[PDB]
Amino acid sequence: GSSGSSGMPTNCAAAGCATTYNKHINISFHRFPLDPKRRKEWVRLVRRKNFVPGKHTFLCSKHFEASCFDLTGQTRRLKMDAVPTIFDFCTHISGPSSG
Ligand SMILES: [Zn+2]
């Protein structure tokens, strides 16, 4: 953060993740997008049932390509039009989704 304050152990919605509150972790907590296009995506990507973002729903900046943030113009704020292009949820072993 910048001015700190309001520090709480906000778990990560992502699956197979290990983020919460280490020490040197400078990861930023970016809740879900207020947009329907992304909102559904984040949930459809996080791979966690048909759950919905209501509270404590956030994702680490590690699952995002970063470039999807608002750095182009200083700082780095997760664009409301961004989405987790990754997640490394290891579907099964290596094969695609198919199903
Ligand atoms: Zn995470």
Structure-determination technique: NMR
Give residue 96 CA to ligand 1 midpoint distance, Å: 23
* Cα distances (Å, whole numbers) of residue 95 to 32, 44, 92: 29, 19, 7
Q: Return the domain boundaries, the chain.
A: 1-99
- β-pair partners for 59: 30
* 61 phi and psi angles, rounded to 5 deg: -75, 5
* Cα distances (Å, whole numbers) of residue 31 to 11, 59, 94, 96: 11, 6, 30, 28
Give residue 64 CA to ligand 1 midpoint distance, Å: 10
Give residue 46 CA to ligand 1 midpoint distance, Å: 9
Give residue 27 CA to ligand 1 midpoint distance, Å: 9
39 in Cβ contact with 32 (< 8 Å)? yes
